[PDB]
Amino acid sequence: NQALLRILKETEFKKIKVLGSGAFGTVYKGLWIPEGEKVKIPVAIKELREKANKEILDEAYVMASVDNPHVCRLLGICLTSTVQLIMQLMPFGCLLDYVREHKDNIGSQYLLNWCVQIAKGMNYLEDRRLVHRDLAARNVLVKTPQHVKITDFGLAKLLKVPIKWMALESILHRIYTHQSDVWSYGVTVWELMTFGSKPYDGIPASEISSILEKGERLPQPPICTIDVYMIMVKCWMIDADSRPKFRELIIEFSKMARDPQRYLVIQGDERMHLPSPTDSNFYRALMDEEDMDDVVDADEYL
Ligand SMILES: */C=C\C(=O)N1CCC[C@@H](n2nc(-c3ccc(Oc4ccccc4)cc3)c3c(N)ncnc32)C1
């Protein structure tokens, strides 16, 4: 579906501010102004650091074809000897920055729900027989605090390797599968549960395969019950086929979401809440009108 990707002229948009800079590229806050109109519409622009345009376009069409509440869809592209990718601007930013900023005051309901949502997005990709190759907290965007979407799908294929998120088989032989995606998902969950901690920090990348072969793993976060830690451990099993499936993960986390205090131990959690319906309705109307499955709420509390 070529209609899904908009080809943008340089004249119809402008980069206004740098939001972040990456090995993959630089991300800018931008404005689209549509031809013949007086409106300036905020957009996010990713300019890749630096394959012919035909190959790039062909990859781009697939990237534009992902349509799920929990995956970000590439909206537009401009090809000018630099590759510029256009998507919605998300004021909330990446999940990783968000958890660090809120590290004191994030509730168990949010964390479990984020786990469900990410799994839902990954599952959609698996169902489509597509592999992300770079799942990480940095690569999840926050639409609203209640709603998160996986981003940068297909970028890894298109283009400093994230060794510390990679499955052993990926590090060793660069084999990427839904099962390697599951491994990355586990690291991502660990990031959330540690409020933005950097996995294997201080361990050189060159040693990572060896420690994994030894069987060393990321440690259990203090907030996590063993039940949650075991799910991460299952994600990092050497035999890829043994690892959990995204469809299973959606169910497990959803179950946990029903009695959060059973599975995550957080100080003052009783004080921290998912939004009331009134608040949720307000957020959706203002900035999140797309259809999504309702957040899983505690059985006790509704
Ligand atoms: C934790 C991530 C981080 O540090 N960032 C730096 C600041 C910007 C932030 N960010 N990135 C995007 C973003 C992501 C992807 C794309 O383009 C795509 C889309 C789909 C597939 C491949 C490439 C563009 C922009 C942000 C957006 N969209 N809004 C707000 N912050 C974004 C990452």
Author numbering: 700 to 749, 754 to 862, 875 to 1017
Sentences from the paper on this structure:
Ibrutinib, an irreversible BTK kinase inhibitor, has been extensively studied in the B-Cell related malignances due to the effective roles for interruption of the B-Cell Receptor (BCR) mediated signaling pathways. Recently Ibrutinib has also been reported to be effective against EGFR mutant Non-Small Cell Lung Cancer (NSCLC) and now being tested in phase I/II clinical trial. Given the fact that both EGFR and BTK kinase bear a similarly accessible cysteine residue (Cys481 in BTK and Cys797 in EGFR) in the hinge binding area, we first tried to determine if ibrutinib binds irreversibly to EGFR mutant as it binds to BTK kinase. In summary, Ibrutinib inhibits mutant EGFR kinase through formation a covalent bond with Cys797, as other irreversible inhibitors, but due to an unusual DFG-in/c-Helix-out binding conformation, this irreversible binding is much less efficient than other irreversible EGFR inhibitors such as WZ4002.
Covalent binding of ibrutinib to EGFR Cys797 was confirmed in this structure, and we found that Ibrutinib binds EGFR T790M in inactive conformation, although this protein by itself crystallizes in active conformation. Four EGFR T790M protein molecules were observed in the asymmetric unit of the T790M+Ibrutinib structure, each binding to an ibrutinib molecule. Interestingly, despite the same covalent bonds formed between the Cys797 of EGFR and acrylamide of ibrutinib, the four ibrutinib molecules adopt two slightly different conformations in the piperidine-acrylamide moiety. The Met790 side-chain well fits to the inhibitor and make beneficial hydrophobic interaction with the phenyl ring attached to pyrazolopyrimidine. This may explain the relative tolerance of ibrutinib to the drug-resistant T790M-bearing EGFR mutants comparing to the first generation inhibitor Gefitinib. Ibrutinib forces EGFR kinase to adopt a distinct DFG-in/C-helix-out inactive conformation. The bulky o-bridged biphenyl moiety of ibrutinib can be accommodated by EGFR in the inactive state only, while WZ4002 can bind to EGFR in active state and probably also in inactive state. Two major differences were revealed in the superimposition First, the beneficial interaction between Met790 side-chain and the phenyl ring attached to the pyrazolopyrimidine moiety of ibrutinib does not present in the HKI-272 bound EGFR T790M structure. The terminal phenyl thus makes direct hydrophobic interaction with Phe856. This interaction is not observed with ibrutinib since its terminal phenyl ring does not go deeply enough in the ATP binding pocket.
